[PDB]
Amino acid sequence: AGYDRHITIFSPEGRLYQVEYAFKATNQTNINSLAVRGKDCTVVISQKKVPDKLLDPTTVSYIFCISRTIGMVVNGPIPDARNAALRAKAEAAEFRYKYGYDMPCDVLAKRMANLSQIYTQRAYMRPLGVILTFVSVDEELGPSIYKTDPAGYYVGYKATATGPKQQEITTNLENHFKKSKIDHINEESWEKVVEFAITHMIDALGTEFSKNDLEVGVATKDKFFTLSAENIEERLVAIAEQD
Amino acid sequence: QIDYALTAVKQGVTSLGIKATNGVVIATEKKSSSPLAMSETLSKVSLLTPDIGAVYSGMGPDYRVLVDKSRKVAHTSYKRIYGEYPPTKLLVSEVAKIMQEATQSGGVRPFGVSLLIAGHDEFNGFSLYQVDPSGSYFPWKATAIGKGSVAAKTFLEKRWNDELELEDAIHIALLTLKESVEGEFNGDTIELAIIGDENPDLLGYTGIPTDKGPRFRKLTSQEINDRLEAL
Amino acid sequence: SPEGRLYQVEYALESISHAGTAIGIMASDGIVLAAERKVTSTLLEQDTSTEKLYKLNDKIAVAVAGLTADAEILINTARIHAQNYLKTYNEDIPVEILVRRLSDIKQGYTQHGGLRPFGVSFIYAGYDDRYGYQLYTSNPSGNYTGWKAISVGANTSAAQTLLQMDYKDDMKVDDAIELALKTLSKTTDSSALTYDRLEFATIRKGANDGEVYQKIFKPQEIKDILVKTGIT
Amino acid sequence: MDIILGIRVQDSVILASSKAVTRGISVLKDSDDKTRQLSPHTLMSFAGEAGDTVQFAEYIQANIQLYSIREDYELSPQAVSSFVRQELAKSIRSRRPYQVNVLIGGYDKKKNKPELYQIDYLGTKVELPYGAHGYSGFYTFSLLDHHYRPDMTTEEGLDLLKLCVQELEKRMPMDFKGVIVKIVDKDGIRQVDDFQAQ
Amino acid sequence: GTGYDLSNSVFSPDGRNFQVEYAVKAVENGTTSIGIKCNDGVVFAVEKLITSKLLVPQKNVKIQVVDRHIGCVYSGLIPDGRHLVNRGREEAASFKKLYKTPIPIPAFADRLGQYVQAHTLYNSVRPFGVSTIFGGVDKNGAHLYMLEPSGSYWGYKGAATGKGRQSAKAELEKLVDHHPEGLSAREAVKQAAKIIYLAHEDNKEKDFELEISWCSLSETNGLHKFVKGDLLQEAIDFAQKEIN
Amino acid sequence: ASIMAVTFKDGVILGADSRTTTGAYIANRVTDKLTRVHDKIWCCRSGSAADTQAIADIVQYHLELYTSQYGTPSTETAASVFKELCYENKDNLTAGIIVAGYDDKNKGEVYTIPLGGSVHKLPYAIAGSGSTFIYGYCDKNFRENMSKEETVDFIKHSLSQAIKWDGSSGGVIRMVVLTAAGVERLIFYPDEYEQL
Amino acid sequence: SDPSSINGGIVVAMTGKDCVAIACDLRLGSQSLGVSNKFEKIFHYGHVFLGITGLATDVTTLNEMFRYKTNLYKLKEERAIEPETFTQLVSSSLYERRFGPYFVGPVVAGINSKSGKPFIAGFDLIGCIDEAKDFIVSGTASDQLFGMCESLYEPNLEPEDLFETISQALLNAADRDALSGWGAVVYIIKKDEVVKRYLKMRQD
Amino acid sequence: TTIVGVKFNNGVVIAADTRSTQGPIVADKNCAKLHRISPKIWCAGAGTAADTEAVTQLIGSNIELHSLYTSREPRVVSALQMLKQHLFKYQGHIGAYLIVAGVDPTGSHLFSIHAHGSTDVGYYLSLGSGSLAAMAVLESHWKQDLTKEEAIKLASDAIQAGIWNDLGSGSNVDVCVMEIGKDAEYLRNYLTPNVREEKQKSYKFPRGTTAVLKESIVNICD
């Protein structure tokens, strides 16, 4: 009867009800993220929220290392994020083996978006409640930022933001690439690009951060790594001593 | 249920196609889901064979995985047997068969796209085809699909004669797209491809005079702006 | 299937009396096929499709009234049965055997009721040296039937009447070419019949000997025989 | 092997077929009809491997009695031939290949002509005036070359047949214990049981 | 229309998979079970309810062992605990067979995570009726994890789940507060016995046996032995003293 | 071929010749028989070039994926992935491999995987066609806990011999030094190792 | 024993001035014994000709097969299949059974109807395409034919001339060949007319 | 068959002869042994005629489709890894011995692939029945950092060595020059040393020489 609301088929106005709902799930964690390009780096800041005093912060991560070169940050319930990360960590190991070069950021995204699409067209499987933000310093394109969503869509961003207060963060960035009229952040060392990414997020969220409320991922050529508890405090200390 | 998919096609950005005497042309707009996004990272006009391209209206993703499945079928079912690439008519047939099966198969919804496939084969000359979610397909002198569908389809009857040079049809398909345009109108929000003369410039090699290069050429951000000034 | 009724069939059997209109007339020394084309736009490319008249082998051909994408799935498999009966017995496939081969796939869904029946109704025109020239019919019911003259699709009930009227057994081939056009006088929702709303075909006693030529008409050749009366 | 002969004349086709069945050391039967009727006007004689022989001819008999019954039409010789061939050509790259050689002879009721086809276990098919499998051909083909006219009465052709069998009994080391001669014409398939003394 | 909660894969209008949330209710209505991460291992404890006098003492074991060095305890539908721990071992032995080293705790957790999470993907299989507490000692020390029916899992300093959930979680936070450096392997055992004895007042109707197991790099040389005999009374007697 | 690996105070060193022969013909005289499956876990290939290549290729993957999920791989693990391939596929392979690597705990570790598919941990191991001639030199001249340049020399001599006596061995002598401070690739040319 | 050398026979093809010729012997024999003298080795599919030598039951099977394959190309593609194309279909088609090959030695010959260009090519049993401007040979007299052609051929022969040339190459090879002969046939293929002459040769 | 590859400063060049031998006979005196995998990735085929073609047609098709999924120029090292792993799936039963070279976004590359699945990276390589003649030239005249024209002379010099001194090789010399900047150039029959001197006679037969039995006209189109 009224069961085009429960599976991935067409409503009478060409809508996929189940996908639109799937999107609504990506906020359910209540973490916000943003990503930026440098002259030759890429940066992803996500929030870390550890409410339970019984937790171990070190195990709480929405930032996944997918390959040597490629980083991914998810907005969405943890279970679904891992289902995606594990599948990417493996589509990219397979890619290297079959084809002989490291797997490139935008290709991994097209492949997860293609996947995210099948879910969108098959009755029996459900999409995932995640929005995967992929970063790297791809050997041909430079700093890359590619985002895929439960809809099956992917596209590449100068910078981007995702989650609950997504549009407050997004509109801050828009007003700083209208102003430098480019496609990136003209700073050499990634450190200053991380400071900038934290700055323009404090500005947009109207709250300060401590070394414990942030997760930072960084991509330079030949490496993608995450910043430790302390590697961030240093970044924060430097923001505070100029602002 | 096929009827509901044709409806997702009816909304979603306008796209068109015009056959001429010495070429075919297809175009759509690149609606930026944001200014932060770099619109060059997504292609609404995709190459299938060096003699055949395609554009769509509707659901982005369903087009991507249809352009992929489509390139492959060109090899698996033609090139690997007869050494040639497939003719527009038949590659189109093999795509309709692909979509017509998502229809009549259980557990899957049809695709949310109508396709415009343009191309040139040595024996059938030029031709332009439309493919619907229903798996049906029809041959067109020119048409449009999507929102601006009705406005543009009417403009094309008004402006189309069977003596158009390809440059005339480029000119038309730019006007046609100018009235419907949702966002801004330049080379960064227009995608236009043609199926014209053989481009040896673009082969990548030189030494066999029997194969002469792609008929499919995707106009650069520049080539477009240049035409829009003298417009 | 309440009273002894084939529901999902009548559904599609009457979906047929909507789309298309096709005719077959068996003369004494030839056969004739003919069809009207779906609601056409100015910009639709007339010459290409051959959308409702398909060749099956050098000696057999069908007229379609139904969903195009649906008949192509059938015809594709019938053009193959033809060739399998060649590679196998090195003789051209006999018309009834090809007809039954399809009719049996149609009725295949009319019973394994887990997939959906066929649009499409066929007129088959063929020659084989066992039963002279032949004319057949194929509703998705599964049944086939012999015909000296026949019709399927919209305005069906109407043409069957004019046909019954002007038909004579001694008929030649050119006499039957007319009877076909003439009686798409009536059964035409489009006031006035053009060469572009048409598609035509013949299987004659050859343009030369005692053999069998097949001929799907090119547009110009239609506007030429239309010239005999229709429009001028 | 095992004598398989056949000659096509003017008004019919004639098939000779050794009567003996040998199992290594002993001759087990002195009266073997080495032929299955494929239909009113189509006959198939055969020789070759032990069990493979019959099992094939019967499979063909079934499949042709089935096309006969289904279309209530008597399948033409050319066709029965080109079918039997494909069935052998299929089994030659199969797991265990039918190892059988055959002569198909029959009356094409539509051309009112007689036809003789020769097919070896490989699927090798050709149409002939006369034919044979095994070594049968060496002693007899020299005689047919010489004495054969294609206008030969059915009687004139039986005579020439006896002459071949006589040469085979003289210069051939096998005791094949006679032949059974069958004739195929407009009236169908009849058997001459007065031969080793006509 | 509605009916968004009779099928498992199905998204409620605001992003929720309801069948999972219902399973969590089955967890909440079962035996209470805990885990404590000390300075060189982990201690595990469970509440065994006593239906009638005829249940045999000490002889209905709830805590399951994985490999040789890992412990699992669960609260809820018990047979689902077993089906999960079974797939848990097939996995931990795939790993050992190929990579020789016995499976690392964090990598083990990710493997259960995916089995569970994958039971939230199709309308035709129901989520697990257990929140599972598990852990052990690997190449880099001790790890305690907890994994709910949704597939969610994180690493805890301590954890609880079951009827006495909120109650234990609160005594657990008390220790992480007093002793930041973690408890001693032996002390953590005495305390786990306290905490179970307390979270029993939320189910005080029926009677109960305690059950403790541990994995300590000093007290069981890295392996997962049970706590028995003298050391078990050591703690049963420590609970009685902090209940009175 | 003709290959070996030695452990010491600071780590592990891999050594090999560079001569792949099909028949009497040296098809390549500069072969890189030192192949890398991870930052500081490499192998020595010997046997079918097609077999050892395919295996190392497939191990490079298993370990790239193991890194993705579970982290950095023990040298021990690399060995287990090799054995599992070689043993479970013995009927169709001809490969003898030496896996060697440096972690921080154990430092120098070396595993030799003979043809069978067996696995043997050792302080040093020799293999490849021309090994037969230096079982004598090595057992007499090897010591535990050698210095970096002590070990380079031990390898240079051992392999200088193997190549003298083996026709299926030769080319240049390649080494690869695996320590905390990183990966250092060595090469010694004929004009040098022959004069020893 | 040897499959290519059981029934035997030869086939040969040449080019001339805007024309092509293909020819064969009519022999089919089990080893030493000749069985038929009316077994042609050249078949046509539209305007594209195919000669096939070697094993009879495979020569026959491949005809029966390419008829099928090309008949459907005509119906599906709306045109008759070209020589250049059909060549590529025989390659891929033969190589389909790479590890259990048809023991044949095909020669394709005909004229591309759009470009009017003459075209010949030959294959080995697994589909290597030897395209050649001059001539293609195949059979049990692989060698003899190569000998005749290498001497008797000049490019751009007028058709009535290239018949004499191709006939003499065929005839004189099969006379030095035990497993070829017993008749011969020679197709001469102009841009729109095609003449098929049978030849007189020894019969031994 | 003789084939070689030679790396130079701004690219790589690969060359081959043109003789295909069935046993002791020469079936094509001029078949190109130069195969195209991608516009600027070519390879030289030696071994079973059919297999170098088929396995090229394939990896090249897959590689074409892959350059389209990835919106990226096809890399030599891809064509290598796909060929390597295909040949090896097939326990050597596929008789391809290739020199695979080209230019991609990562520079100039030159590799050789043997049927069983082994690969070799080098600066000069040779394969096939004249492998040894060619490699003898190459080993005598190759210095590091050639130039376009030096490297071509060298490969053609090394193919000649094969032609003459090997019964397995002969006729002409094909070349393909893949410069890093430019398009690839394929010079078919870059050298034609083996031209057949004009015969001593002409054997054009006087019309009517051949005895005809029966004559007739076949019909071409229906």
On the CB side of H79, CA atoms within 13 Å amount to: 35
Which chain C residues are Cβ-neighbours of G71 within 8 angstroms? 57, 83, 86
In this complex, is the C-beta atom of B47 within 8 Å of any C-beta atom belonging to chain H? yes
Contact list in G for residue C80 (CB cut-off 8 A) is 72
**Nearest residue in chain H measured CA to CA from F22:** H114
CA distances from D57 to B88, D37, D47, G148 (A): 50, 9, 10, 47
Closest CA to C178 of C123, C232, C226: C226
C134 and C95 in contact (C-beta within 8 Å)? yes
Contacts of H97 (CB under 8 A, 6+ apart): H45, H46, H47, H52, H112, H113, H114, H115, H127, H128
Domain count, chain E: 1
Q: What ranges do the domains of chain D cover?
A: 1-195
Looking at CA atoms only, how far is residue G76 from chain B in angstroms? 8
Parallel/antiparallel/unpaired status of strands C53-57 and C60-65: antiparallel
Q: Angle at Cα B149 formed by Cα B144 and Cα B152, nearest 5°?
A: 75
Q: How many CB pairs under 8 A join E and F?
A: 26
User: Is residue E92 a contact partner of residue E64, using CB atoms and an 8 Å limit?
Assistant: no
CATH of the domain at E17: 3.60.20.10
* Helix, strand, or coil (residue C201): strand
Q: Is the minimum CB–CB distance between F187 and chain H shorter than 8 Å?
A: no
Q: Residue E44 phi/psi, 5° resolution?
A: -125, 145
Q: Do chains C and E touch (3 or more CB pairs under 8 A)?
A: no
Can you give the residue range of the structural domain that contains E172?
A: 1-244
**Structure tokens given for F169:** 């061995």
| Distance, CA of G177 to CA of G196 (rounded, Å) | 23
| Rounded Cα–Cα distance for residues B195 and B191 (Å) | 14
Backbone angles phi, psi at B116, to 5 degrees: -115, 115
Residue A168, class by beta-carbon neighbours within 10 Å (0-12 exposed, 13-18 middle, 19+ buried)?
Answer: middle
Contact across the interface for G35 and D118, Cβ inside 8 Å:
yes
DSSP 8-state code for residue B41: G
The class that CATH gives domain D1-195 is alpha beta
The domains of chain A, with CATH numbers, are: 1-243 (3.60.20.10)
CB burial of F96-105 (b: ≥16 within 10 Å; e: otherwise) equals bbbbbbbbee
Q: Alpha-carbon dihedral of residues B44, B48, B51, B57, nearest 10 degrees? A: -30
For residue E236 the two structure tokens come to: 């049963």
Phi-psi region of B178 (alpha: psi -120 to 50; beta: other; left: phi over 0): alpha
- The answer to whether residue F92 neighbours chain H at the CB level (below 8 Å) is yes
- Considering CB atoms only, which of A98, A106, A140 is closest to H81? A98
Q: In what order do the strands lie in the sheet with D4-8?
A: D130-133, D4-8, D13-17, D181-185, D188-192
Verify whether the Cβ–Cβ distance F68 to A94 is below 8 Å: no
Question: Which of G44, G125, G130, G171 to mutate to test binding with chain H, by most H CBs within 10 Å of its CB?
Answer: G130
**C54: Cβ contacts below 8 Å, ≥ 6 apart:** C61, C62, C64, C71, C75
CA distance G172 to chain B (A): 36
Instruction: List the determination method.
Output: X-ray
Q: Give me G102's structure tokens.
A: 């048809």
At CB < 8 Å, which residues of chain D contact G?
85-86, 88-89, 92-93, 118, 120, 122-126, 128, 131, 137-138, 141
At how many Å resolution was this determined?
3.0
CA distance G130 to chain B (A): 15
- Strand pairing report for C149-153 and C21-26: antiparallel
- Residues F98, F82: Cα–Cα separation, whole Å: 9
User: Do the chains A and D touch each other, judged by at least 3 C-beta pairs below 8 angstroms?
Assistant: no
**Least Cα separation, residue A51 to chain F (angstroms):** 26
Distance CA H122, CA B84 (A): 35
In this complex, the chains that touch H, judged by 3 or more CB pairs closer than 8 A, are: A, B, C, F, G
D152: helix, coil or strand?
coil
| Residue C133 distance to chain B (closest CA, Å) | 32
In chain C, the residue whose alpha carbon lies closest to the alpha carbon of D75 is C89
Q: Phi and psi dihedrals of E243, rounded to 5?
A: -110, -20
Q: Which 3 state secondary structure label does DSSP give A214?
A: strand
Q: How would you classify the pairing of strands F124-127 and F3-7? A: antiparallel
In single-letter form, the type of residue at position G128 comes to C
Question: In chain H, which residues have their Cβ closer than 8 Å to the Cβ of C58?
Answer: 222
Minimum Cα–Cα distance from H125: chain F residue: F28
Q: Any bridge partners for residue B57, and if so which?
A: B114
Tokens read off for C117: 């029946």
Amino acid at F105: K
CATH number assigned to the domain with residue range G1-204, chosen from the 4 options 3.60.20.10, 3.30.1310.10, 3.30.1360.120, 3.60.21.10: 3.60.20.10
- Cβ neighbours for H29, distance < 8 A, ≥ 6 positions apart: H18, H19, H170, H171
Largest CA distance in chain C: 56
Q: Are A14 and B42 in contact (CB < 8 Å)?
A: no
Phi, psi of C32 (to 5 degrees): -135, 135
Burial class (CB in 10 A: 0-12, 13-18, 19+), C39: exposed
- List chain G domain ranges: 1-204
Query: Does residue E31 carry a catalytic annotation?
Result: yes
Q: Which residue of A has its CA nearest to E117?
A: A79
Return d(Cα G160, Cα G21) in angstroms, integer.
11
Phi, psi of E175 (to 5 degrees): -75, -45
For residue E15, list chain A residues with Cβ-Cβ distance below 8 A: 21-28, 129
User: Contacts by D169-178 with C-beta closer than 8 Å and gap 24+?
Assistant: D171/D139, D172/D135, D172/D139, D175/D20, D175/D27, D176/D2, D176/D3, D176/D18, D176/D19, D176/D20, D177/D18, D177/D19, D177/D20, D177/D27, D177/D30, D178/D18, D178/D19, D178/D20, D178/D30
Return d(Cα H183, Cα H164) in angstroms, integer. 32
The angle formed by the CA atoms of residues D111, D115 and D117, to the nearest 5 degrees, is 140
CA distance D125 to F101: 69
User: Can you name the residues that pair with B27 across neighbouring β-strands?
Assistant: B16, B192
Listed in sequence order, the residues at least 6 apart from H196 whose beta carbon sits closer than 8 Å to its beta carbon are none
What are the φ and ψ backbone dihedral angles of C77, each rounded to 5 degrees?
Answer: -80, -15
H28 and H193 Cβ atoms separated by less than 8 Å: no
Report whether the peptide linkage leading into residue C92 is cis, meaning its omega lies within 30 degrees of zero. no
Residue G82 DSSP class: P
Residue among C55, C87, C90 minimizing CB distance to G75:
C55
Q: Per the structure, how many domains does chain H have?
A: 1
Q: Give residue A36's Cα distance to chain centre.
A: 11
Chain CA centroid to CA F48, Å:
15
Angle at H179 between CA H177 and CA H180, to 5 degrees: 150
Burial class of residue E165 in the structure, from the number of CB atoms within 10 Å of its CB (0-12 exposed, 13-18 middle, 19+ buried): buried
Alpha helices in chain G (DSSP H): 56-77, 83-95, 142-152, 159-174
Which residues of F, range 10-39, sit inside 8 Å of H by Cβ? 20, 25, 27-28, 30-32
Shortest CA distance to G32 belongs to which of D138, B109, H91? D138
Closest CA to C142 of C167, C113, C117: C117
CA atoms within 13 A on the CB side of C96: 11
Reduced to 3 states, what is the DSSP secondary structure of residue D190? strand
CB atoms within 10 A of CB G92: 17
Q: Find the CB nearest D125 among G33, G55, G60.
A: G60
Token code pair at residue C182: 């003439």
Distance between start and end Cα atoms, chain F:
21
In eight-state DSSP terms, residue D155 is H
**Could you tell me which chain G residue has the CA closest to the CA of B88?**
G77
Residue C92: what are its φ and ψ, rounded to 5°? -65, 140
- Alpha-carbon span D120 to G131, nearest angstrom: 35
User: Cβ atoms within 10 A of the Cβ of F114, count?
Assistant: 15
The stretches of F26-147 forming alpha helices (DSSP H) are 49-70, 75-88, 135-141
Q: Please provide the distance, in angstroms rounded to a whole number, between the alpha carbons at the two ends of chain A.
A: 60
